[PDB]
Design a protein around this ligand. Structure first.
Ligand code: HEC
Ligand code: HEC
Ligand code: NI
Ligand code: NI
Lengths: 106, 106
């Protein structure tokens, strides 16, 4: 899968969590988001195609996925503890991670 | 200044920027936010007193302020270009940083 695919997965599944018709859909969507974020961390965004892997722009891009994965894991822990409403509230706060990275690099 | 006064400065100046309609107003408010964030960048929240300076929790707290200052700096550059509406949109996006740190450490 490519970066565009990963971003579609992130977008669809964030919306799944918001509209989840049952509690179990939340964990499943978070699981897919986690994998998409780790896959996207290994891509080069078009606006950074000139930059080397050691460039500060690429460093911040990769770090954004690490941080998103950490907050996905926090929400997964809540869901796995049965605190699914808390997990859904935590998932809503993931949008700020999308917005921040996009501000820089989308 | 203390943490609570620094936080009040950030809180009030976000609204100053939203209320503004010219580049000088936005620049002046962003400059005040920058000074507040810096004054608190080296401090320690109550819930982290018993933590090493290099602990993961302290490191994430400090990265919170460093990253907020970076995005204030980016919004300042927009104001300095006369890009009032873009600077205001960047300022509104700062709220993600506020809520992210609070949810971890408030
Ligand atoms: C960087 C660390 C990112 C994070 C976190 C998220 N996204 Fe992203 N996104 C990023 C880039 C660099 C791009 C541009 C990709 C390109 O090839 O142009 C995008 C793009 C999107 C898109 C549009 C995809 C397309 O087909 O053009 C969507 C729908 C999208 N991103 C969604 C999305 C969501 C919902 C995120 C949070 C859960 C998210 N992204 C995180 C970089 C980064
Ligand atoms: C961590 C890196 C933070 C960032 C970024 C922001 N804030 Fe914050 N805030 C933080 C702490 C640890 C605290 C509590 C301090 C304590 O000793 O309890 C706060 C508190 C506030 C408050 C309430 C003030 C009070 O006296 O309780 C407000 C109104 C506030 N913070 C606003 C605010 C805004 C608008 C921010 C972004 C622009 C922001 N904070 C960032 C830690 C951190
Ligand atoms: Ni975090
Ligand atoms: Ni950033």
């Amino acid at each position: 899968a490519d970066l565009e695919d990963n971003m579609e997965t992130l977008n669809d599944n964030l919306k799944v969590i918001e509209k989840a018709d049952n509690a179990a859909q939340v964990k499943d969507a978070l699981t897919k988001m986690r994998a998409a974020a780790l896959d996207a961390q290994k891509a080069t965004p078009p606006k950074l195609e000139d930059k080397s892997p050691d460039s500060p722009e690429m460093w911040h891009f990769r770090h954004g996925f690490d941080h998103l994965v950490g907050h996905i894991d926090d929400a997964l822990k809540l869901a796995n503890e049965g605190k699914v409403k808390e997990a859904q509230a935590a998932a809503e706060q993931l949008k700020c991670h999308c917005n921040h990275c996009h501000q820089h690099y989308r």
